[PDB]
Design a protein around this nucleic acid. Sequence first.
DNA 1: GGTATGGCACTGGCCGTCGTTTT
DNA 2: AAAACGACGGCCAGTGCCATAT
Lengths: 399, 411, 958
Amino acid sequence: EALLEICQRRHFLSGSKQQLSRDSLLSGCHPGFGPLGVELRKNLAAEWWTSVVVFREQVFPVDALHHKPGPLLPGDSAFRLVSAETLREILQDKELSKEQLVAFLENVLKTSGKLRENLLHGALEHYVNCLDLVNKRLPYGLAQIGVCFHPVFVKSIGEKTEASLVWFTPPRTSNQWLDFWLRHRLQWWRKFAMSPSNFSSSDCQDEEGRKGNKLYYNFPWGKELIETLWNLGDHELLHMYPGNVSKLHGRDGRKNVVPCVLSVNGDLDRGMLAYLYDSFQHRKVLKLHPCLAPIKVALDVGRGPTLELRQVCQGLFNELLENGISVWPGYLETMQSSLEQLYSKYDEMSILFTVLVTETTLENGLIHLRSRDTTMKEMMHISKLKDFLIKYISSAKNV
Amino acid sequence: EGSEALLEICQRRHFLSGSKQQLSRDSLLSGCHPGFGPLGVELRKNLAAEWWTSVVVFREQVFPVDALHHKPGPLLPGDSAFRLVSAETLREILQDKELSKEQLVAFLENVLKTSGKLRENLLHGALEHYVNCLDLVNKRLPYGLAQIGVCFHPVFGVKSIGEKTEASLVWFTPPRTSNQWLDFWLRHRLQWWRKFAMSPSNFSSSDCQDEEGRKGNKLYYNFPWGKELIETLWNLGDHELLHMYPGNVSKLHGRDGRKNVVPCVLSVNGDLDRGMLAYLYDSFQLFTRKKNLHRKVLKLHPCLAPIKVALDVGRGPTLELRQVCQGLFNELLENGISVWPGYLETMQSSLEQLYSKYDEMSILFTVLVTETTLENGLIHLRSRDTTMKEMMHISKLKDFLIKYISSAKNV
Amino acid sequence: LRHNPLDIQMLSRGLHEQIFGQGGEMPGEAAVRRSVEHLQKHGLWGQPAVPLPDVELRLPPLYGDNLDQHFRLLAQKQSLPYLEAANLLLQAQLPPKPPAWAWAEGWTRYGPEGEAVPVAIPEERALVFDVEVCLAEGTCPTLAVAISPSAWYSWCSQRLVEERYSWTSQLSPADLIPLEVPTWQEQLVVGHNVSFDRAHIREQYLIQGSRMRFLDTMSMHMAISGLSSFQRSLWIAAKAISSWDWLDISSVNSLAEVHRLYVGGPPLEKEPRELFVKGTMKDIRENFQDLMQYCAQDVWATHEVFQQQLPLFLERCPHPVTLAGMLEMGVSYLPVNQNWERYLAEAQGTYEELQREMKKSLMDLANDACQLLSGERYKEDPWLWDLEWDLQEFKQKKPCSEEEEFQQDVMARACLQKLKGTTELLPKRPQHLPGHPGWYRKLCPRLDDPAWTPGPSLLSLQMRVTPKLMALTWDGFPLHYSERHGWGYLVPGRVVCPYRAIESLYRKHCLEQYHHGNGPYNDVDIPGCWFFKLPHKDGNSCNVGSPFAKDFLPKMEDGTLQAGPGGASGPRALEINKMISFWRNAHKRISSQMVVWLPRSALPRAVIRHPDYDEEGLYGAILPQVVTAGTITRRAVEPTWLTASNARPDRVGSELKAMVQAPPGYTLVGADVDSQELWIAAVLGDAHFAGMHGCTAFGWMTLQGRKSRGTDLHSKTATTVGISREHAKIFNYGRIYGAGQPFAERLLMQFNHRLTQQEAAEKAQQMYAATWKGGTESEMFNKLESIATSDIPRTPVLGCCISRALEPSAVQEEFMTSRVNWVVQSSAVDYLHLMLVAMKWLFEEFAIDGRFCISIHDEVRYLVREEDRYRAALALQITNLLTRCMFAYKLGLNDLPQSVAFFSAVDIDRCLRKEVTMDCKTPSNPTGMERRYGIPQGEALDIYQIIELTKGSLEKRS
DNA sequence: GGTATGGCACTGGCCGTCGTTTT
DNA sequence: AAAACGACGGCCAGTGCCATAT
Ligand SMILES: Nc1ccn([C@H]2C[C@H](O)[C@@H](COP(=O)(O)OP(=O)(O)OP(=O)(O)O)O2)c(=O)n1
Ligand SMILES: [Ca+2]
């Protein structure tokens, strides 16, 4: 598709033309993102954090390691870290053992640690200790954004950035909470969508019979899952702390009950790809939402003395940067390119506005301003620009 | 000796996590601790944001980069570093036996070769993107790539793994000015590390050289037990860059003035976890007034403290106080101010204990509302630095706080 | 020559014949009896006469019979055109001023009846020029008026008649006043304080030597009828304890007083609004006519005073060398690169960082000390008990899961808005932190301050509380401040006074081990304690300010001044203060230097061909605003550059001079006279008696001096007194300049121990006498006391008479010390003039493309191209020789030692520094100068090396 | 000895005006 | 609803030390 070519050309996805592919992007074995893609993912994660964690006092941040050592339960599909040092020291003095091959395989899968599969286990590791943070008030949650490792069908390994919220709630109001969370998540995914009808949700049941919901985005080829909500009862919590239960009770209306666990897990890489496909529509432009565009405004120069316009543009760059506006310093070298090519280049990169500064700015302070959505041209006094931009962005956030 | 109390507070107020045994000097320094508490996570986020805004955002040639956490593909056999294996094939292995005498012990060679390793530093990933990032600046030689991420280090199962989060900048320069830039960056970095420090004299630097005769510099923090490295600078030059792309060297060329040359690679790498530990140690008391004033408080910099303002409630009509508190909470959060909702907790805690707890948590200001707030809107505000309580009108609070933070940031 | 009586090595074989010639000389008076007898009684007949290798070089041809006529010839050939041009100003008369002032761009010439015609350039070989600048906008000149012999001229700036949103803040030659005359050519410009006006000329920044020269009226006023630094204050105050005839022959300061003295008539009115300093640019845009008419008065007065002045200067200094040196000495030129901007930024940043570190160190102390309010605990503290611990009362006028619930948040914020609506009950003028203590209140900037900062940002050093907060102690006793006696300390003894706390502090300090010192004043009524003043480097009964003076840094290292019981890091605070003080004082002046960045299109091609030419580099220049002869002794004055301060390891801004770097493809060649201020006196004393160098003890010591044995005057005096050689200068120059027994008394009291007490009156006998006119060190009195009391005191070498304010007829007894010192200082001035004229002649003759750069504090520097550096050195070296010869000739001596025949070494460098063999490291740049900016080390040469590299030929081609 | 210069802290004295009181 | 006023705020200038310069 042309969209992949645009992303590669404008440094959204790293790697070479040969490496990039749909399956690699979906699985998580792609070489990596470009700076623009990294900034877009950062904006997406910041928006998710703002919508989920900060405004709610029952959600706290937790950090979990990318692996855990120690004894392990056999029968899992995760990545086990084999010890190269031990086998190399053995290679120095290879022993002539006969039967111990399968025994050594059992030993290595019994002792050696393994990588991280999901953020749910790490979050549950902190249940008891974080319960103290709320004086044992049962309804609460823990949120985290982190990378996860998965196997890809010489089994390969793939990385996926995921945002996960684990909610501990009394069994009496579990289902309601689930629905509540579901609704919010869906609306959030629809908040920045140019076509919100393309985000959908469905119902599902575990093999045991536990209820849950799934969130899907209708990609051009077909629907793809981006987030899952699962009601997991209390099996995992009890298994993690066998035997005594007095250290897992939580207070709910002076009634001590064992909480039910709700797992909300949404992957940010596939969500970012979905937003890239959504923003893409005779012009080639990515109408990224203003709150998600990695670079807001493009700044350049026109015709005139280089040393004056450079100083003016540098001052404008500093002023815009001090206020939290991301700018692309295109004035560092006169592109010597027609405005058509420059406009197309900034349209492919999803830049909200383009600012042109020339000696007329020195004369009376008027700068040329070009829009992305309405492709209109305006003349504005320089000192106003900053305020205008802020207001515009704020409006886009509030509507 | 005196750090026992500091670690006790860090554990109690959820800066770290674990137990008195798991949390220790060696475990914290190596990087194999259980992890940080939510306050520790917020502190790390604040430090990372400050580093990013002081290194990357205000520069017109620095760009972000993401490097995978693992290195796939065939490897050289001598490293002996840990390896990644999927056991969905090891389970297939367990179904039979084959050449189990000597040759499948030499199969450890294949294990070494066809298994990837966990990322050990961000320098390799950054260098892997040098060619593709020349299109961002039209091949202007002075330009950099910055990243913040976790890397794994083996530590003395006989040997385990420790994870450390650090920030790295790879700066490509012209060969002639390399040292110049080095000096500059050194200065800048030192300044940055001394910006938030309450005692900047505890940060120091020292020159050094490698066995290959290349320049370098190191930054140290004076922990109570001694000086510990926290950031290192290296003038790599051309070794790795040439060793990575042999052959058509012209594609490594970049413009410096009028001359196309191969840039010198300069590396800067500062460990964020040890930086947070150093800042936590700096902000403690550890001078007769010190012997008389026993107040234990972590005087973290306002730009770094995890929690900015604490909100509470006095006795009165719970409905109206709750309404005004919810409104104030929403207003404060809308403007990038982090708040601690202490009004939900019951009044079982007295004012003195609340002040002690909030000082231990390093909260800048404590705001209290009462029915007087309903009647005229004058709330109480206690300052962490001075422990003095002023009355002040609600309508200005947000503004004031914002100004404070900004007026502390822009110094 | 090889030797002479007293066995002192003389000039080489061929050189003496080349300059002097073995004829027309007497072997002294055929008698050395007095000299030998005196050198015997003093016991100073040592003979460490190790010969120095001799060299022979063909000197450049000379003119006239002797050296004096050669120098006069070159001075006339240099100063003829400019005297001729000034004669035109003398002769001509001009019509009255125009009825109205024009409003155009650039230059306009006013006809006889005010008909203004635009012109490209004044186009005259003469001018009286004044320049005005709008200080608020920046440094770009605003308008000017020029008086020509036949017409009036007015220049109006482009920035004044055109309105623009913004202007470049980086000055360029295209934004200055032009006076270019491309290709009589020797143009002359006259003005009052003309350095300022010269700084605003377009072509004055060109690297190539400009044939135009400048002349100042204040310089001539100082030379003819100036006032000494002592005279000026009395002259102003009265407007001398026995005579006042001088009161009506000297002016001061403004051009108004100069015009009153020299011409007189209608007093010059001063503009009460001073728009060019106070008012903004729009104010000037409307007051154009009045301001320009005001400015025309200055040029008219300058013309009148120059008319009344020039003949007097031409008469007092009949020697053309003086005029040539004056013309050349005001044409300084300091190159600068973009490293100047980096230096400014780095110095300011380091200043700010260190000051912020110190201020935060005090802020933490204040925050910690704010906590003893609870339980009235401050009252028991032995330091903070005496402040104001008051509080002003604040006063005014008389489970389940939620549904959508979009209503709850909106209603909550509506309630918040309704509560906000209660602003009408608050006073319009806010209170200032009533909950804090008063002493904390004073330090907190007001909430409405436009540059408000968090916490007590007004705290700093040298305040009545900073040493109080630090809990400083002196010898184990806390400090105490009184209103009238100044800082000191409090000793325990026998609003409530904390006697017990102070006594307990003393007891806690005594375990680790009636005091005496400043008198125990009993007027400060503290019943249980005694107040002792902190001793000053001066005498007792004098108040003392901040104990953080640099004087106490070593004393603190003794272990008596401490901050341990309350804090620590006192030495660190003193270190920052010492590092900071210089920049704290000089930042406004240094940052205000007018730098004009020359664009690429007009650089000489030699500076863009070089491999070091940085494309982004900015290659500009700074023209020092030196007021030539700004002091009675005719020495140039400028507070910024003309000072004997250089890079130091500890001072942040001491790297100032190192920023004057030659442009790529150019070099600095410089020298420094080997103690000329002493050689002048030695040669005068020697020639007073007999006609051979080394007549008496002092000439013998200064000649063939030896640093190894320490027989040099500085080292000999240092070992006689026991102080360091570098600090010995004050002990000698004060004595040489007739500072007197009271000086040798008070310095000996002050400088160090064992020289105070009766020694201060009994030790100077060794340095000044032995068992009024004669005796050891007194032999000098019998020469200067004779030349400074003649009816027309004059310089023995060139021949300018002392200012009219210090004639014997005007002043008879007062200003005697300044009178005697004027001889030596003016001798140094004439040396500088002779040097400058000689090197201009040599550069013109041998086609060397260098030019004079600056003469700081008896040093001399030159900017040359790389390809000729060696030649410059050779020229410089030979120059010194002839100058010394001239001195020897003009004082009646026909010989010259080879010890003083040349400089110690000539420095070839890429920048300006005291010595090449040092690296300028400062807190502003701990990295070496060779590594922070990438500049080589440089070196210095001696005669033989330049001879060998140049093959003994000064012509370009070898 | 015998001054002047720039910087900065402290302090009385001046005018202002905003809440405050009469009419 | 008008017009006066008193206990407290910006602000210029004078007094007094200290570093630089020599
Ligand atoms: N208390 C002082 C200190 C110094 N000077 C002046 C007189 C000298 O002319 C000037 C410069 O002296 P140097 O330190 O430059 O001494 P020389 O001129 O002897 O140079 P060098 O330092 O090489 O001896 O110092 C003075 O008049 N009074
Ligand atoms: Ca000197």
